[PDB]
RNA sequence: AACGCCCCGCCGGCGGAUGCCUCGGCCCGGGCGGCGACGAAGAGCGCGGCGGAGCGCGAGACGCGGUGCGGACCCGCCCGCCCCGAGAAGCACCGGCCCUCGAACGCAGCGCGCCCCGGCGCCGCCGCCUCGGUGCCCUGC
C-alpha cells in the first residue's frame, strides 16, 4: 500500500488508514512538513498547535483567509488545523521510532523525505431540507503515509 | 518567476465493468388428477441442553410407537453409541398424539350461560314417540 519505493533501504516508515480527519487539511499539513529535519518538524508542529506558526495552503485555498504569519512563504493564505496536526505528529513519531530501532540511526540525521495522502470512503448521514427533501451529509477521510530517511541529496 | 491549472514515464487510491464460472430460471414432452363436520385450505400462539429468522412439529410439541432395510457416526461445545447385534447417521410403509380461531357448531370474542344425571348449532330424507283442527266421517251422550 506504500506508494514510495527505492534502494535507500535505510528509511523508517509508518502509515494509518481511514483517518477520521479532513483530507484537505491533512494534505496541507503533510506538504508543509516535507523536507524538514525531524526535530525542527516537531518544534514546528507544536508551534502550530498554539498559533505561533501557520500552515500555508497551496492547493485547497478558496475560502482560506490572509494572515500575517504566512508572510515570506510563497503564499498569503494559511490556517491552524489541530486534528490534522495531532494525527501527523502521531504518525511521524511512529516512523522515527521505526527508523531508529531498525537501523540504529540517531535522530539528528533524519529528514522527512516523502509523503502521500489519499482519499478514502466516509460515513454517510442525511440532512433535511425544505419542502420535504433529503440530502447527504458525508465526511471526507484519508489515508496517510510518512517516510523518514538520511537526506534528500 | 514561483504557485495553481493543464499534458508524459513509474507507484498508490476510488469504483466496479470485462472474462471465466454457476445446486437458479424459461420452453417442449410424458405422467398424475388425490381436499373437507372422521373438522379442510388458511391464520395465531407455543415447542430445542446452550435457540433469533426459516423448515418441522403440537402440552406425548425441533417429535412418540410398530414392521422391514442400513451399518458408524453424531455441522460448534457437550451428551450418547461402540461388541457376530449389543445399533449412530439414513430410507420406506403403518399406528397414534394433535393448543386457539377458521365452512366453524351453547351465546360472545377473550367475557358468560342452561342443564338433573352429560351434554347443549342449522337445513334435509327416512323412521318412531307425543299432540292440534266449527277438515271429511262415525259412534256413543
Ligand atoms: Mg467563492
Ligand atoms: Mg433543514
Ligand atoms: Mg414533511
Ligand atoms: Mg426460530
Ligand atoms: Mg368455537
Ligand atoms: Mg359463534
Annotated binding site of A for Mg(2+): 128
Resolution in angstroms, to 1 decimal, for this deposition?
2.5
Rounded Cα gap, residues A62 and A77, in angstroms: 10
Residue with cell 504566512: A70
Residue A124 is given by DSSP the state -
Residue A128, C-beta contacts closer than 8 angstroms, at least 6 positions apart: A134, A135
User: How is chain A split among helix, strand and coil, in percent rounded to 5?
Assistant: 30, 25, 40
Nearest nucleic acid nucleotide to A1, CA to C1' distance: B12
Q: What are phi and psi of A44, to 5 degrees?
A: -65, -45
Neighbours of ion ligand 3 (CB under 5 A): A 132
Nearest nucleic acid nucleotide to A119, CA to C1' distance: B13
A31, three cell numbers:
506538504
**Residues in chain A whose C lies over 2.5 Å from the next residue's N (breaks after):** none
**3-state DSSP call for residue A150?**
coil
Helices (H), chain A: 23-33, 38-49, 82-103
Rounded Cα gap, residues A15 and A143, in angstroms: 8
Rounded Cα gap, residues A91 and A1, in angstroms: 16
Amino acid at each position: 500500500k506504500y506508494a514510495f519505493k527505492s534502494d535507500n533501504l535505510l528509511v523508517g516508515k509508518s502509515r494509518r488508514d481511514g483517518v477520521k480527519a479532513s483530507f484537505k487539511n491533512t494534505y496541507s499539513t503533510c506538504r508543509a512538513i516535507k523536507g524538514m529535519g525531524v526535530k525542527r518538524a516537531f518544534a514546528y508542529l507544536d508551534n502550530v498547535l498554539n498559533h505561533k506558526e501557520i500552515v500555508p495552503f497551496f492547493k485547497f485555498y478558496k475560502g482560506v483567509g490572509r494572515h500575517s504569519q504566512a508572510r515570506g512563504s510563497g503564499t498569503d493564505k494559511g490556517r491552524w488545523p489541530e486534528k490534522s496536526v495531532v494525527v501527523v505528529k502521531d504518525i511521524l513519531k511512529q516512523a522515527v521510532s521505526n527508523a531508529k530501532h531498525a537501523h540504529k540511526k540517531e535522530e539528528d540525521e533524519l529528514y522527512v523525505i516523502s509523503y502521500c495522502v489519499n482519499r478514502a470512503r466516509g460515513r454517510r448521514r442525511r440532512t433535511f431540507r425544505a419542502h420535504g427533501r433529503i440530502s447527504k451529509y458525508e465526511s471526507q477521510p484519508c489515508h496517510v503515509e510518512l517516510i523518514v530517511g538520511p537526506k534528500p541529496l
